[PDB]
Amino acid sequence: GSDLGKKLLEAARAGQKDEVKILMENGADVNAVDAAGGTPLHEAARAGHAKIVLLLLEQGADVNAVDAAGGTPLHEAARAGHAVIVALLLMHGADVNAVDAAGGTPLHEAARAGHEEIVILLLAMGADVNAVGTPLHKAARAGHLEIVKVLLDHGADVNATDIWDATPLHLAALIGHLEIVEVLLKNGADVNASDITGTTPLHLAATMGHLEIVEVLLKYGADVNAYDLNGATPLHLAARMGHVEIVEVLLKYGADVNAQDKFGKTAFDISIDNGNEDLAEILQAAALE
Amino acid sequence: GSDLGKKLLEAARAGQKDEVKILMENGADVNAVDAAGGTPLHEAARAGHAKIVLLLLEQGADVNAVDAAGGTPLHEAARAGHAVIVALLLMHGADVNAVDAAGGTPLHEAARAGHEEIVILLLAMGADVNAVGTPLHKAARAGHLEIVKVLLDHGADVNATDIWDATPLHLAALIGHLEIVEVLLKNGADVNASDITGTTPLHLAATMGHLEIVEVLLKYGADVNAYDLNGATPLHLAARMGHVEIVEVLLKYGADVNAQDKFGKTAFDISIDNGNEDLAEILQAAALE
Amino acid sequence: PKFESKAALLAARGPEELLCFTERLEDLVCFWEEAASGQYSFSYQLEDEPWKLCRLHQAPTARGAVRFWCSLPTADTSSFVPLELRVTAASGAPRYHRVIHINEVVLLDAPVGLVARLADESGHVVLRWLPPPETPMTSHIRYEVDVSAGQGAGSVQRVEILEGRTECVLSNLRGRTRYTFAVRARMAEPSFGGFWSAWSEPVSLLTPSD
Amino acid sequence: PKFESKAALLAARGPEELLCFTERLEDLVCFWEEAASGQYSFSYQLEDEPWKLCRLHQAPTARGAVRFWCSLPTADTSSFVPLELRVTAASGAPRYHRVIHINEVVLLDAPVGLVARLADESGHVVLRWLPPPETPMTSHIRYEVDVSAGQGAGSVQRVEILEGRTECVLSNLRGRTRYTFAVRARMAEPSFGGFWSAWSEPVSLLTPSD
């Protein structure tokens, strides 16, 4: 904007509370923009300087100004974890479900970054719990346990699917987040939901070697002998990865030892192919039964 | 209220997030009251449990419920420094200028306790900067520098007087908070304001032995030879307390050595009465001029 | 009683000043002493409550010095907060006006139960003691150990003990020497301020032969 | 090149697994090796951005083992965030699906510039070295020192060095003995995870006579 305007962009960024007041008193344009179409409000929300955020909003700063990437100060404050500023912005009418070029809402960014309080504050002001680019996918992936708890309490879709056919339980299973898998299951997550590849949560748990998770899934009624597009059961995947304990847990719950995949290979075949002594001994015993 | 109601007062206090949800799902009365007429909302605001505060307000908890002492959850959250909860309450319409039996507003408590962000949040939602039992008196007394800065920026009365005729500058001077005295002076605090006892800020500074403050006051035009109800000048008070350096600073700025109080005593008289060698030497020299 | 000891310690620090202190964090006495002329009013304000008064007691002392003091109630002894005090004459002239913190004027009793023991090696001594009886916040009390020797040696060592620790290890001592030990107490920063307690009961030891 | 060394170290740790690692925090290669049957699709999603693809490179190795690998751009190498990876066959069957963190798979180069020096007293040795060249976060790198002696003594000491410290003091050593020293590097927790680097260039010293 004015020459004082970019001096103000200088000062806002720097968190220089004295200098900000000086430049504004000199008639600086509060909605001056930088190269990125960022406003001093964007910069002050990013650095988390309360008093600058006060002085800007009191002088009519645009609460929902967008930079070239579609980002509002509410997006940046939610991303940077400045709870107070998020509050100040929200009180002044910041758009809870404005979306960046990427389809991201503040709730998206807050959930991904693991800012508990901001997620609470957003939800209380009516953030869409099941908007595009699902927060539950990110929270599940990242292992933000409490956030996943808050998400579910606020009515988030437990079995929402991304572009792959993956549900939050798929991601939780894969990453070995046991409690999250617990919370998900008790809220009615589908234990035998399949992505397009024919993978169930149990498949992921067996493959990654997450023993207890495999047990929790099994207790809630996961299919021990479900097959993917390879015609591979959890026992096939467990075998390939040499997971002895998991093979035993699979056996406990009624696994088919002589299930053949689309190569015609059994788990025992796999064990010989890998020269896995331990697996071959236990699988050999199971095959004769 | 109900039997589950006090179980809920039990659980809210304890911060037991699981148990709170359990008791409410069983039909607990959200506005049950204890012996003190405190609600679970009071208790949850006190302990700062975000999710309990969420679940209560979502189930119609009375945002401005008063206990027997006139205290709203906003008062307790401001006093205990739970910023988020203060935000949640404010968004749900908590009364910014509700007053306890003692005439205290949330802004009163937040300023006294030194909760910067809460003071900001209260002020943004329109807290009365100059309400009864002045926040500036407490902030000045306590030495909350930044809070005093925020108070003054938001238009607080620099020369508000309590029941004694004391202004914030009186309190700042007395406690030896140099910067605060600076900030106050630049915003137009009266350097020669008098309480009912005839005391100016300079009197307080001289008596407590705050040398630099005495200097700052003097630069801004404080009366070096102002008298209280004893007819005592700063030099009298400095003498009684044996403050050598302050006597010298007083001398620099034109102090009357032979001013007599209502006892007829000069500063030099005082020095002999206390057997103060140092003072008597310098005052003796000053008396002969 | 034990009160008189502490009042004398303070008076020497600041004559004709308004000295307030707390013994056990659960009370407060403010006092001053002055010459020839209760003819005074003691008022106080505590943190967001209206201005109240306190019954002044007048008693004599020293060379013509009258001592006025006020004992605040246990009701108004909550800590960590500005407590505004004013002493105003009958005539309505000001006399004193302070702002103090309750927690910042702690003068504890002396430590007790000194136990001095020789180490397994010559030159080392183990000292143990007890916090001031019936005091809270034993964790925030710091001590100082004084090591004297007789025969005009005077004070040879002055050792600060960490907060809450009622144990002291001394080294660097001369063998075959009768040393005398005392400890005093004080409240550790920055949560609390104040003065050193009076010095404890002494115990002595004769170090072994080296 | 130096890449081959690290790929071999990992393959021994997890055969037929999808191994991803970072050399200098500014790139990333994921790779796996398999037998007889790019016929594979490498896709990845990074923190709130849509699913992208990566050009797979196919090259042979070992006993009939084909190694597929993908080098992600420097654009998508920001750390501390979940990075979702999927390897899917031509046929559309799943093959791998992991979630890793960029920061949690650091395999640094070996430390360099070993300098071993005798202490002023027998039995003590001072070792110094340099962080892996052209690496950031030198402050978060921890090292381990191996002390070997010849003649079937093998590894006698294994000493962990604190984060950022490129200095080691050894004691408890036999005098008149030719000892051999090496150091490896690793990223300290909990900000970073990974494996130990390959072992550094050795230097030897002959301890004095005791």
Side-chain angles (χ1 to χ4, degrees), chain D residues 41-54 56-60:
Chain D
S41 169
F42 199 97
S43 44
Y44 66 94
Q45 196 262 289
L46 177 57
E47 63 185 342
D48 201 55
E49 286 188 313
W51 275 88
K52 329 193 187 303
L53 291 167
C54 183
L56 282 164
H57 310 72
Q58 162 179 321

Side-chain angles (χ1 to χ4, degrees), chain C residues 102-181:
Chain C
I102 293 93
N103 53 312
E104 283 184 10
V105 287
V106 183
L107 225 191
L108 310 150
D109 278 338
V112 295
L114 262 72
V115 156
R117 293 290 179 265
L118 286 187
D120 301 306
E121 63 286 351
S122 182
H124 303 247
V125 166
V126 172
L127 184 62
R128 322 195 167 270
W129 63 93
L130 288 175
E134 306 152 320
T135 314
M137 279 302 216
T138 62
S139 281
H140 278 58
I141 312 183
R142 57 189 257 262
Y143 309 88
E144 188 184 22
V145 176
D146 167 278
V147 187
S148 295
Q151 319 323 314
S155 184
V156 310
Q157 277 195 39
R158 281 295 187 80
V159 172
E160 292 206 354
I161 309 307
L162 332 178
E163 337 95 44
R165 312 207 181 184
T166 51
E167 181 170 345
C168 173
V169 182
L170 291 160
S171 315
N172 324 284
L173 297 180
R174 172 138 156 92
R176 290 216 343 171
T177 304
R178 183 204 170 99
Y179 284 108
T180 294
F181 311 95

Side-chain angles (χ1 to χ4, degrees), chain D residues 142-146 158-161 182-185 196 199:
Chain D
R142 57 189 257 262
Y143 309 88
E144 188 184 22
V145 176
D146 167 278
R158 281 295 187 80
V159 172
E160 292 206 354
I161 309 307
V183 48
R184 51 178 171 175
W196 282 112
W199 283 104

Side-chain angles (χ1 to χ4, degrees), chain B residues 199-236:
Chain B
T199 305
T200 68
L202 181 65
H203 283 103
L204 288 178
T207 300
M208 274 287 286
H210 298 312
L211 172 69
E212 293 78 7
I213 294 160
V214 165
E215 176 186 308
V216 170
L217 291 178
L218 291 173
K219 290 171 188 158
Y220 293 121
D223 182 358
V224 71
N225 296 299
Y227 56 92
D228 67 6
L229 285 171
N230 275 289
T233 67
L235 181 66
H236 285 80

Side-chain angles (χ1 to χ4, degrees), chain B residues 180-192:
Chain B
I180 290 169
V181 165
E182 178 214 17
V183 182
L184 290 184
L185 286 181
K186 293 183 191 188
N187 289 286
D190 181 359
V191 74
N192 296 302

